[PDB]
Amino acid sequence: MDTNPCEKHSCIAVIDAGSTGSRLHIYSYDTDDTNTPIHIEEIWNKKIKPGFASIQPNSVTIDAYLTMLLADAPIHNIPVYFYATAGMRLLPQSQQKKYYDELDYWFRQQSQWQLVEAKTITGNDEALFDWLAVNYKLDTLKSVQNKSVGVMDMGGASVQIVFPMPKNAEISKHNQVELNIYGQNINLYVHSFLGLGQTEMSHQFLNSPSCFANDYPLPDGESGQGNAPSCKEEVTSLMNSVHKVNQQIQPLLALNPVNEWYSIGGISNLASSQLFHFENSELTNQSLLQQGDNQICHQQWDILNGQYPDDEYLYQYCLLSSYYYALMVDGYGINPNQTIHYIPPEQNLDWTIGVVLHRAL
Amino acid sequence: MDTNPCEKHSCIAVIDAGSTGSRLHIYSYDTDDTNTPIHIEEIWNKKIKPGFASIQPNSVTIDAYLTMLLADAPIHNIPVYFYATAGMRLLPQSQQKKYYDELDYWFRQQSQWQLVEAKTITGNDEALFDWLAVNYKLDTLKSVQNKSVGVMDMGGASVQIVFPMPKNAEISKHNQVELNIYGQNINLYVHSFLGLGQTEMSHQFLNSPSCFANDYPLPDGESGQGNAPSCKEEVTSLMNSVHKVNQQIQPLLALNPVNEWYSIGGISNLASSQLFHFENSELTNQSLLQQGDNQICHQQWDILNGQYPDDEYLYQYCLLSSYYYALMVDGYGINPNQTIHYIPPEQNLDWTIGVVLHRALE
Numbered sequence: 104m105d106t107n108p109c110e111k112h113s114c115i116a117v118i119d120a121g122s123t124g125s126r127l128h129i130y131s132y133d134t135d136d137t138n139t140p141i142h143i144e145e146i147w148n149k150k151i152k153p154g155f156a157s158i159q160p161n162s163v164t165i166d167a168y169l170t171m172l173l174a175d176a177p178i179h180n181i182p183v184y185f186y187a188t189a190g191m192r193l194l195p196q197s198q199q200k201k202y203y204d205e206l207d208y209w210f211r212q213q214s215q216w217q218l219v220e221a222k223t224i225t226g227n228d229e230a231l232f233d234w235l236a237v238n239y240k241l242d243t244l245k246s247v248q249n250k251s252v253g254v255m256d257m258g259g260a261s262v263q264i265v266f267p268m269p270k271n272a273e274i275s276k277h278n279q280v281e282l283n284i285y286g287q288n289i290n291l292y293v294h295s296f297l298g299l300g301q302t303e304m305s306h307q308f309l310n311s312p313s314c315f316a317n318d319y320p321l322p323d324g325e326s327g328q329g330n331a332p333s334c335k336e337e338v339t340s341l342m343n344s345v346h347k348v349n350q351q352i353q354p355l356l357a358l359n360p361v362n363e364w365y366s367i368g369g370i371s372n373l374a375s376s377q378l379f380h381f382e383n384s385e386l387t388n389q390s391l392l393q394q395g396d397n398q399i400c401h402q403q404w405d406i407l408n409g410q411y412p413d414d415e416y417l418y419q420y421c422l423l424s425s426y427y428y429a430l431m432v433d434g435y436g437i438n439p440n441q442t443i444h445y446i447p448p449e450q451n452l453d454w455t456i457g458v459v460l461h462r463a464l
Numbered sequence: 465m466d467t468n469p470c471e472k473h474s475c476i477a478v479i480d481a482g483s484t485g486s487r488l489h490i491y492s493y494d495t496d497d498t499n500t501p502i503h504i505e506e507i508w509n510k511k512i513k514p515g516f517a518s519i520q521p522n523s524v525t526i527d528a529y530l531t532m533l534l535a536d537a538p539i540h541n542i543p544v545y546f547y548a549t550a551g552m553r554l555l556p557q558s559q560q561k562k563y564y565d566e567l568d569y570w571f572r573q574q575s576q577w578q579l580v581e582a583k584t585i586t587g588n589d590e591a592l593f594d595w596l597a598v599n600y601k602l603d604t605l606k607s608v609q610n611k612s613v614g615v616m617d618m619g620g621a622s623v624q625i626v627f628p629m630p631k632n633a634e635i636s637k638h639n640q641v642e643l644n645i646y647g648q649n650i651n652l653y654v655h656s657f658l659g660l661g662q663t664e665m666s667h668q669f670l671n672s673p674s675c676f677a678n679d680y681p682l683p684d685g686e687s688g689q690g691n692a693p694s695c696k697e698e699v700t701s702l703m704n705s706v707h708k709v710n711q712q713i714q715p716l717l718a719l720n721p722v723n724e725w726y727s728i729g730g731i732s733n734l735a736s737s738q739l740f741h742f743e744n745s746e747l748t749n750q751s752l753l754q755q756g757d758n759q760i761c762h763q764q765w766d767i768l769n770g771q772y773p774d775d776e777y778l779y780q781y782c783l784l785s786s787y788y789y790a791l792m793v794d795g796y797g798i799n800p801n802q803t804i805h806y807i808p809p810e811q812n813l814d815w816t817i818g819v820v821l822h823r824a825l826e
Contacts, residue, residue: 153520157518159513159514192670192683193667193670193683195776195779195780196681197776197779198776223683225683225684225685226683226684227684227685260667275686277684277685277686295684297667297670297671297683297684298667298668298669298670303664303667303668306554306658306659306664306667307658307659307664307668307702307706307707308659309553309554309658309659310657310658320557322553322554322584322586322587322658323553323586323587323588323638323656324586324588324638324826325636325638337706340705340706341668341702341706344701344705344706345668345698345701345702345705345706346668418556418558
């Protein structure tokens with residue numbers, strides 16, 4: 104990396120304003136003969152909490168939040184994309200508008216950042232960016248691939264799934280995108296399920312004893328009595344009886360098999376706990392469920408809590424192990440012995456590189 | 465009301481720290497021969513937003529919040545009960561503790577309020593308070609009733625149901641409460657659900673076309689196509705296939721019928737809104753679902769939104785009417801033609817009178 108990279112390369116700021124927080128990235132890049140970005144490098148990264156949709160939509164609060172997010176960035180005279188996702192999607196447009204009107208005013212009132220867009224993106228655009236970010240990192244975009252790469256983004260309020268699929272006139276146009284990039288034409292199926300991200304879905308199960316370690320104090324005063332297969336069947340009812348995940352996804356995956364699954368988001372954080380034993384930054388659903396059942400669901404909460412003092416979300420690990428299996432195996436139809444790659448959690452990889460690659464007409 | 469009522473009567477402050485805001489009440493009362501409150505009178509009420517569990521738990525933020533709640537009260541130098549409910553129950557104890565450590569510090573740092581308790585109450589405790597608050601207002605506590613009174617509290621972040629039921633060795637102790645009030649013994653079944661509060665529930669159905677007016681812009685990019693019976697059937701899957709409300713509740717109401725149903729919380733706001741029409745502060749589930757279907761679900765969103773613009777809640781009324789029906793009829797088993805009384809929303813009635821009457825918890 105150069106010293107003062109934005110004096111030597113194009114630069115853009117992309118903010119991922121998700122349900123749990125907002126993450127600013129500044130990327131430097133060069134461009135190829137078609138003015139498409141190459142050599143994308145992250146030169147700055149800053150996350151603040153809580154989610155933008157969780158703060159009071161008044162000037163003082165929104166102005167303090169943007170200042171906290173942006174003021175200490177090393178370069179400011181660059182284009183900014185502020186893209187909010189599932190936290191903002193939980194709100195009606197009239198409520199979202201209060202946030203964007205105040206944010207727009209804050210950018211208009213300063214003279215360095217160059218706001219391009221500030222908006223709630225759809226889950227479908229977000230899934231496209233999920234797939235572009237991962238495949239950019241895997242270096243599979245420049246040449247036509249012989250294997251199909253699927254991507255899952257496991258967020259706090261939505262989950263996305265995205266994989267190659269030829270155009271299909273029986274499927275909504277909203278769930279398909281024809282990507283042109285580096286001279287190749289890519290057709291993807293995209294889907295986002297709102298309410299199935301980990302925070303939203305956990306709020307359906309907090310008094311389920313099967314979903315928590317033995318003797319964990321549940322909110323209404325009963326005790327955990329963990330059992331991952333039982334917990335998983337409860338979560339599967341939300342996936343398939345309420346949201347119809349398997350009816351929508353499985354027939355398409357059977358017709359368009361994915362050779363390599365990659366995930367970003369929450370799986371990385373769970374699977375990296377010392378409670379688990381994985382190698383090569385990959386897991387299978389059967390191993391995740393078995394290890395969460397043995398190591399967490401069937402262990403005593405006070406012992407776990409004292410033994411893993413730096414696992415902030417330890418109390419949900421039995422639930423999360425069970426939920427990931429419900430979503431991937433019972434929802435998407437992925438075999439429980441299929442390898443799922445997870446991007447190493449130190450990378451904090453999100454969908455933002457997708458915006459660098461896709462934003463131009 | 466007296467000039468300073470707390471000079472001649474006992475007064476306490478009760479704060480309902482709920483999901484969308486915190487509401488301070490100051491009550492004056494006298495006590496009867498057993499030191500049980502009578503003549504309870506609300507002498508001050510103030511609601512602030514947002515919910516306590518939504519603010520960042522640091523000293524600057526919590527001082528601004530508690531100042532806004534309490535500093536302009538016309539009376540102070542009284543005991544305070546700060547009881548938080550579902551918004552805080554959605555956080556683990558380790559995270560709640562930061563809030564109460566900061567709140568405890570703020571109270572220690574001042575002189576005007578005497579903090580007695582600041583804690584998250586269970587939904588079972590909240591249900592008992594719901595029942596006591598309504599029955600105190602109905603005057604049914606002092607004497608043995610010929611009728612069974614049931615209460616539902618339709619909250620933002622949980623729902624409660626509570627009704628008389630003799631002590632039952634087969635049911636969890638956590639779902640049964642016994643209390644002696646005005647020298648009478650009262651036994652109640654209590655239950656609360658978080659996943660079924662209005663916020664949590666709604667976050668599972670925002671992409672369901674049946675639950676919004678025609679052409680409403682769903683967040684997934686599809687269009688509303690409202691149909692309240694179909695929306696109700698979708699919400700019933702969360703009630704029964706996920707939460708097993710019917711299996712838990714219906715057998716108990718079959719054995720312990722409720723003669724009069726009262727509700728507090730969101731039903732009152734919906735039913736009193738400009739879009740619905742009910743007489744005598746009561747409704748039937750039949751009529752609620754039909755009104756929502758015709759007055760919201762089957763309308764064109766753009767046109768309806770422009771007709772009723774002072775209305776930021778309207779977008780959700782097809783979903784809410786269908787959800788209330790799914791909860792009451794398909795969950796609890798209530799007959800669609802049974803009267804459900806709702807407390808006039810002008811009263812803003814919450815469960816806090818129950819704390820005046822009952823200082824213990826689970």
